[PDB]
């Protein structure tokens, strides 16, 4: 697997505004999609076949996440709330009020038994699913928090923020373990826990992508070549046909580096506006991509 | 959406 061959297959249109995030179902049969038009749209993760449209938020949504069992979604919207939905209907289960500003990111733990959320009020909050009550609030950073992700077991959350900081928090404790200053305080647009859980993948607004051994505080691989310095663009770990890195870019293309050699390996052209978010289908080697206001569409790409 | 900027 030296080089992949992701060719465009379908083009998915339905969102009346810019698309904020697209995330793949655990079982892989579905593909959720958050937009700036206060809506969510469910699609067939293999054929396109637009199925459901979930509504309820008063303002637009910046992020959605799936539950391990593949039938609940939580949406981080700009009306200071998060909402938990079942996809087996479209009905809003519980609304998680608590935040003071825009809610930016959200994620489910592996056990799907609690929510972790970040917002513009510089605080991360942990929430229980059934009792839509904020289990605890962490004074995360002193700027809006970009991304927030649970590790593979569920005992660690990683948060990043605009104050150039990346924090590792134990969950059922709230105490912060480490923080990655290590440089020139560049705004961290995004961070994700790596698959096997021993690393984090951090994005900073200076057109770089770094993979950290946050344990040692070392950086191990550095992926550049794209444009990223205004929007907090999602990144992915494609681990089905060869081990790569996928991320959007402000030049309207999807950049893919070989995880092991910092090497650009393929760039996918198709979008008219910025590519804000991607996602790699679990089993099948398909990458989805969504763009902003002058594009507002989704694309599936199959290959390996 | 703040993400869509």
How far is residue A84's CA from residue A93's CA, in Å, rounded to a whole number? 5
Contacts of A104 in chain B (CB under 8 A): 2-3
For residues A16-40, one letter each, b for 16 or more C-beta atoms within 10 angstroms of the residue's C-beta and e for the rest, the string is: eebbbbbbbbeeeebbbbbbbbbbb
Distance (Å) from the alpha carbon of A89 to chain B's nearest alpha carbon: 24
Contact B4 A276 (CB under 8 A): yes
Is there a contact between A6 and A302 (Cβ–Cβ < 8 Å)?
Answer: yes
Q: H-helix or E-strand containing A149?
A: strand A145-150
How far is residue A155's CA from residue A275's CA, in Å, rounded to a whole number? 31
| Strand-strand pairing, A235-236 and A297-302 | unpaired
How far is residue A91's CA from residue A109's CA, in Å, rounded to a whole number? 22
Contacts of B3 in chain A (CB under 8 A): 20-21, 62-63, 104, 231-232, 276
How far is residue A82's CA from residue A95's CA, in Å, rounded to a whole number? 6
Tokens found for residue A286: 């398909």
Picking from A60, A120, A144, the nearest residue to B4 by CB comes out as A60
Nearest CA in chain B to A36: B1
Which residues numbered 1-5 in B keep a CB inside 8 Å of some CB on A?
2-5
R_g of chain B computed on alpha carbons: 3
A124 Cβ neighbours under 8 A, 6+ residues apart: A116, A117, A118, A137, A138, A140, A145, A148, A157, A159, A169
Is there a contact between A24 and A45 (Cβ–Cβ < 8 Å)?
Answer: yes
DSSP class of A47: T
Distance (Å) from the alpha carbon of A63 to chain B's nearest alpha carbon: 8
**A36 in contact with B, Cβ within 8 Å:** yes
Largest CA distance in chain A: 48
Distance (Å) from the alpha carbon of B2 to chain A's nearest alpha carbon: 6
Tokens found for residue A127: 């929430």
Experimental method: X-ray
Distance (Å) from the alpha carbon of B3 to chain A's nearest alpha carbon: 5
Is there a contact between A279 and A269 (Cβ–Cβ < 8 Å)?
Answer: no
A59 Cβ neighbours under 8 A, 6+ residues apart: A38, A77, A78, A79
Resolution in A: 2.4
Q: How far is CA A145 from the centre of its chain?
A: 13
Length of chain A as a residue count: 304
């Amino acid at each position: 697997p030296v080089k992949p061959n992701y060719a465009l297959k379908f083009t998915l249109a339905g969102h009346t505004k810019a698309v904020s995030s697209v995330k793949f179902s655990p079982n892989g049969e579905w593909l959720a999609s958050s937009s700036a038009d206060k809506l969510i749209k469910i699609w067939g993760a293999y054929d396109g076949k637009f199925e459901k449209t979930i509504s309820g938020h008063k303002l637009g949504i910046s992020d959605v996440a799936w539950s391990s069992d593949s039938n609940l979604l939580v949406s981080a919207s700009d009306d200071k709330t998060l909402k938990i939905w079942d996809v087996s209907s479209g009905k809003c289960l519980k609304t998680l009020k608590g935040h003071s500003n825009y809610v930016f990111c959200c994620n489910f733990n592996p056990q799907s038994n609690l929510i972790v959320s970040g917002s513009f009020d510089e605080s991360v909050r942990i929430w229980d699913v059934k009792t839509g009550k904020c289990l605890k609030t962490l004074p995360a950073h002193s700027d809006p928090v970009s991304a927030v992700h649970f590790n593979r077991d569920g005992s660690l959350i990683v948060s990043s923020s605009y104050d150039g900081l990346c924090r590792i928090w134990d969950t059922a404790s709230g105490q912060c373990l480490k923080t990655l200053i290590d440089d020139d305080n560049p705004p961290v647009s995004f961070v994700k826990f790596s698959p096997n859980g021993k690393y984090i993948l951090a994005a900073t607004l200076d057109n770089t992508l770094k993979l950290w051994d946050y344990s040692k505080g070392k950086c191990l691989k550095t992926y550049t070549g794209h444009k990223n310095e205004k929007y907090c663009i999602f990144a992915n770990f494609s681990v089905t046909g060869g081990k790569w890195i996928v991320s959007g870019s402000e030049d309207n293309l999807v950049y893919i580096w070989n995880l092991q050699t910092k090497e650009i390996v393929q760039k996918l052209q198709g979008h008219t506006d910025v590519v804000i978010s991607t996602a790699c289908h679990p089993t099948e080697n398909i990458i989805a991509s969504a763009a902003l206001e002058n594009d507002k569409t989704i694309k599936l790409w199959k290959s390996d | 959406x703040x993400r869509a900027x």
